Amino acid sequence: MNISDVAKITGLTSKAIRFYEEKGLVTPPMRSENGYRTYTQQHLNELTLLRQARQVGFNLEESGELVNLFNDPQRHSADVKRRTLEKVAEIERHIEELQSMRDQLLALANACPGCPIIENLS
Amino acid sequence: MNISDVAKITGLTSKAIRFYEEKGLVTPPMRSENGYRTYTQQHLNELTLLRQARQVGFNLEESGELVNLFNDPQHSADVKRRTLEKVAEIERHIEELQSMRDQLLALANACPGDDSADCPIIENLS
Ligand SMILES: [Au+]
Ligand SMILES: [Au+]
């Protein structure tokens, strides 16, 4: 496949695909007799993984490590699990933060008719 | 007040304060006899609103619009409206993080968590 198809299939922008290549986070694409990029199911898997890991909160470095673990035939599922539970703790904190912001906005909204909001924000 | 005083009082950097002005998000300050910016309590109020609006979820334009409403002599329900949409947006964000947490905790529970290569987490993420 060419980069365009890989994009449509993975839900990543060509920009992003080329980016992960520049960072060395995914297996480089192959070059054809013409000098253009072609990918295989293997590249599709690595990129899919990378996309979903970013979606669930993993940053770049971590996402790359997951690709490494993915390509490691002798990976320890325990290592992946520890990383996943750590990531869960972070998501929990992130949730607590957003909840704290939501309560403050709701308080401001409560004290308002149809302006405490603006007055207290400045 | 000069720009440095405003920075100390609001906690914003002088670069940030110059940025807000450059983007017309706040009222431009006047000039002193020597050509330096002079601020008034109105500037402190706009910059504070802007800093707190951002800290509580609003983006730049939304913050700029909140500042425009602030300066208006007249819109209780026009702000309560914006405020409540920002809350709906946050709740949706919370809903999404919760969903990712549960999904990761489901995969982790299915994980052997041992020295074998079989891994449901890696498998259902790639
Ligand atoms: Au209000
Ligand atoms: Au696992």
What are the CB-based long-range contacts (under 8 Å, 24+) for A19-22?
A: A20/A47, A20/A50
Establish whether B64 is an annotated binding residue: no
Domain at B95, CATH number: 1.10.1660.10
Q: Note which residues in 14-43 of chain A have CB less than 8 A from chain B.
A: none
Tokens 């946050």 identify what position? Answer: B90
What is the distance in A from the centroid of ligand 1 to the CA of B53? 14
b/e per residue A99-117 (b: at least 16 CB within 10 A): eebbebbeebbeebeebbb
Q: Among candidates B77, B26, B95, which has minimal Cα distance to B54?
A: B26
| B125 touching A (Cβ < 8 Å) | yes
Residue of A45, A78, A115 with shortest CB distance to B115 = A78
- The H or E element containing residue B30 is strand B30-31
Q: Among candidates B93, B9, B10, B2, which has minimal Cα distance to B52?
A: B10
Which tokens hold the place of B110?
């299915």
Which residue type is seen at A35? G
B13, with CB counted inside 10 A (0-12, 13-18, 19+), is exposed
State the Cα angle at A12 between A10 and A15, rounded to 5°: 140
Which tokens hold the place of B27?
């009222």
Q: Among candidates A78, A71, A62, which has minimal Cα distance to B119?
A: A78
The values of phi and psi at residue A99, to 5°, are: -70, -40
- How many domains are contained in chain B? 1
| Domain extent at residue A50 | 1-122
| A107 touching B (Cβ < 8 Å) | no
- Establish how many alpha carbons lie within 13 A of residue A32's alpha carbon, considering only the half-sphere containing its beta carbon: 9
- Do residues B11 and B51 lie in contact, with contact meaning Cβ atoms separated by under 8 Å? yes
Number of H helices, E strands in chain B: 6, 2
**Method used to solve the structure:** X-ray
Count the neighbouring beta carbons within 10 Å of the beta carbon of residue A20.
22
The answer to whether B114 contacts A77, with C-beta atoms less than 8 Å apart, is yes
Q: Among candidates B7, B8, B4, B2, which has minimal Cα distance to B37?
A: B2
